[PDB]
């Protein structure tokens, strides 16, 4: 009955752990021991964007590295020009509780979702010049935590009902569902090739999904509490996770285990967002103590602090040319650092 | 093209300044516990009530997006200890630590609460009612620091007078917040 199956599961877990231990030839610290340190990383706020009434929950850069979308829980989706601080669009939402937003890689569409369990797709390049709701995707049984456009016709969403999904915007139907998590899925991150992606959930685990076949290939368990953010390394062979135990961790897909832990004795708040700089040498992480930190991903030593916000930092992003960082916060201001 | 961008920014800003007026003059309420949006207006002031019935049973992630709401309406009828524990976890949350609670005791006994044998307020039903109210108030008045309070009520009828009560406690909440900001309370 259940006893034999659970014994088999424990045996398989032990075998997996032993196989992983057989590969621990050395540590990342011993290999990057003789590497020149980054030094001190100092950044200055170039622009401050002020148009939101309530706290900001998400932001996302465009592929041209100039325009960016942001979502606020007053019911607003604002598109900004970051160079000139202008406003391009301001879109009102039917539901004021929006937890995520995304930008199409072509720049023609925008998506959002939240406590309404629905993903809304808006057409920016309207024939009439007016941003109108192109599509509403409704098949989740819990609030949406993340969404990421694969192209103009496909989108991956993650929900609080412990599932991920791939959609078809032309027909508005789910194509495949990714179901292995036992807690809310909090974040997802697409690969550079958009053939796989990773998800982090509230069971303190992360899972690698194959988009085309709709299965789970690897599971990574190093954290001790809920995982809030996840990001992919520039070459797509590693990823970084930040959680509620006040640590970040770096995992390797090919070695199938955790490599580095970025933690400090004076940090006792959770990480709300993570991102990687252009070369993968810096790891940007936002926290609940209102400021972000910069970590030397190869040496796990703090190299700088981004202290400019008066409330909890919710979002964090780096441009595709690597020339600016945008951070939003619960005090309703976005800031751009260089 | 800079002129056109400046003009578009002007239109956006003009609409935003008009939307901010409507946003700030409205009071948003959460209705967890028991019984989606509902817009109702009492004495020329608009209220906006939300009910979150379509989600799962894990509350610790979507509850912290209600940290700017004016008040939380908690309807509570061992089903009592679960409501007490939910209230105790809401009260001590890091993000809901300045939110007031309007408590509706919808019901209107020593085996599950042994402290009842030595509690002094038919008078028996009033003793029971005030025992339950005192349990909730003993949780609330222990870790407040003065930034939020609890307003308990007894509700059993067709609820002809349940809308004026929320009005009255939402007025008291703001009056106390302003009096405390002016160093007067």
């Amino acid at each position, epitope marked *: 009955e259940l006893d034999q199956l659970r014994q088999e599961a424990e045996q398989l877990k032990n075998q997996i752990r032993d196989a992983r231990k057989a590969c621990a030839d050395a540590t990342l610290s011993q290999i990057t021991n003789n590497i020149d340190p980054v030094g001190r990383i100092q950044m200055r706020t170039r622009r401050t964007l002020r148009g939101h009434l309530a706290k900001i929950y998400a932001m996302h850069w465009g592929t041209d590295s100039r325009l960016l979308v942001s979502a606020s829980q007053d019911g607003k989706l604002i598109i900004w020009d970051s160079y000139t601080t202008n406003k391009v669009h301001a879109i009102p939402l039917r539901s004021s509780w929006v937890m995520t937003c995304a930008y199409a890689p072509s720049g023609n569409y925008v998506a959002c979702g939240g406590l309404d369990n629905i993903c809304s797709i808006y057409n920016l390049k309207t024939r009439e010049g007016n941003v109108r709701v192109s599509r509403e995707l409704a098949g989740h049984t819990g609030y949406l935590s993340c969404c990421r456009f694969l192209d103009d016709n496909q989108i991956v969403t993650s929900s609080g009902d412990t599932t991920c999904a791939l959609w078809d915007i032309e027909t508005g139907q789910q194509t495949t569902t990714f179901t292995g998590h036992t807690g809310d899925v909090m974040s997802l991150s697409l690969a550079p090739d958009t053939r796989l992606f990773v998800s982090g959930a509230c069971d*303190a685990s992360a899972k690698l999904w194959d988009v085309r076949e709709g299965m789970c290939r690897q599971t990574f368990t190093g954290h*001790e509490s809920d995982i809030n953010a996840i990001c992919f390394f520039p070459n797509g062979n590693a990823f970084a996770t930040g959680s509620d135990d006040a640590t970040c961790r770096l995992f390797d897909l090919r070695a199938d285990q955790e490599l580095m832990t970025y933690s400090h004795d004076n940090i006792i708040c959770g990480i709300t967002s993570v991102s990687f700089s252009k070369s993968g040498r810096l790891l940007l992480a936002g926290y609940d103590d209102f400021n972000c930190n910069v970590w030397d991903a190869l040496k796990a030593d703090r190299a700088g602090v981004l202290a400019g916000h008066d409330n909890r930092v919710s979002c964090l992003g780096v441009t595709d040319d690597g020339m600016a960082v945008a951070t939003g916060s619960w005090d309703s201001f976005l800031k751009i650092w260089n | 093209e800079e002129k056109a961008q400046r003009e578009a920014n002007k239109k956006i800003e003009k609409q935003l300044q008009k939307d901010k007026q409507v946003y700030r003059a409205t009071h948003r309420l959460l209705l967890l516990g028991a019984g989606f949006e509902t817009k109702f207006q009492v004495d020329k002031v608009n209220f906006h009530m939300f009910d979150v019935g379509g989600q799962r*049973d894990e509350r610790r992630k979507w509850i912290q997006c209600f940290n700017d709401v004016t008040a939380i309406i908690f309807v509570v009828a061992n089903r009592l200890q*679960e409501a007490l524990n939910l209230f*105790k976890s809401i*009260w*001590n949350n890091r993000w809901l630590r300045t939110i007031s609670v309007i408590l509706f005791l919808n019901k209107q006994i020593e*085996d599950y609460f*042994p402290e009842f044998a030595r509690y002094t307020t038919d008078p028996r039903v009033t003793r029971a009612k005030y025992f339950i109210r005192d349990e909730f108030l003993r949780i609330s008045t222990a870790s407040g620091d003065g930034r939020h309070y609890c307003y308990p009520h007894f509700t059993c009828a067709v609820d002809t007078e349940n809308i004026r009560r929320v009005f009255n406690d939402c007025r008291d909440i703001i009056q106390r917040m302003h009096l405390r900001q002016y160093e007067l309370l």
Partner: nanobody, 126 residues
Framework: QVQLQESGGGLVQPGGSLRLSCAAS????????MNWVRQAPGKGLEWVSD????????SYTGSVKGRFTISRDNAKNTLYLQMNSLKPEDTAVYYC?????????????????????RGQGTQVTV
């Protein structure tokens, strides 16, 4: 990986004494609050007891107040429940549950249908 494993229990006559134990691994035991939860045959999960990070604060449900005792050994990373003067009502599955996050004062979601940081439980028949 967060693992909690419970031991102790079985069949006892009314008035007997048992000592449930819960051994935890995969996390820092002393940063978290710990709880005892039970599921009776026929009803839902019910909260029994809780103990804080150091053991100074202790709370019991009404029906067990006076005849159950919770304690934690942080050096050995283990949690206990001493149950004496048992009743036929006390028969249930007993789980050892953990707070979602460290250093916090609130314990959300511990008695949910599908919770991630609680053990598999042990049966107690009286």
């Amino acid at each position: 990986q967060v693992q909690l494993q419970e031991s102790g229990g079985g069949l006892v006559q009314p008035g007997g004494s048992l000592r449930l134990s819960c051994a935890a691994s995969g996390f820092t035991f002393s940063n978290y609050k710990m709880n005892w939860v039970r599921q009776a045959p026929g009803k839902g999960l019910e909260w029994v007891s809780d103990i804080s990070q150091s053991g100074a604060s202790i709370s019991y449900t009404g029906s067990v107040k006076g005849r159950f005792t919770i304690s934690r050994d942080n050096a050995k990373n283990t949690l206990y429940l001493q149950m004496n003067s048992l009743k036929p009502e006390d028969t249930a599955v007993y789980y050892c549950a953990r707070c979602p996050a460290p250093f916090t004062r609130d314990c959300f979601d511990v008695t949910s249908t599908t919770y991630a940081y609680r053990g598999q439980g042990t049966q107690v028949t009286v």
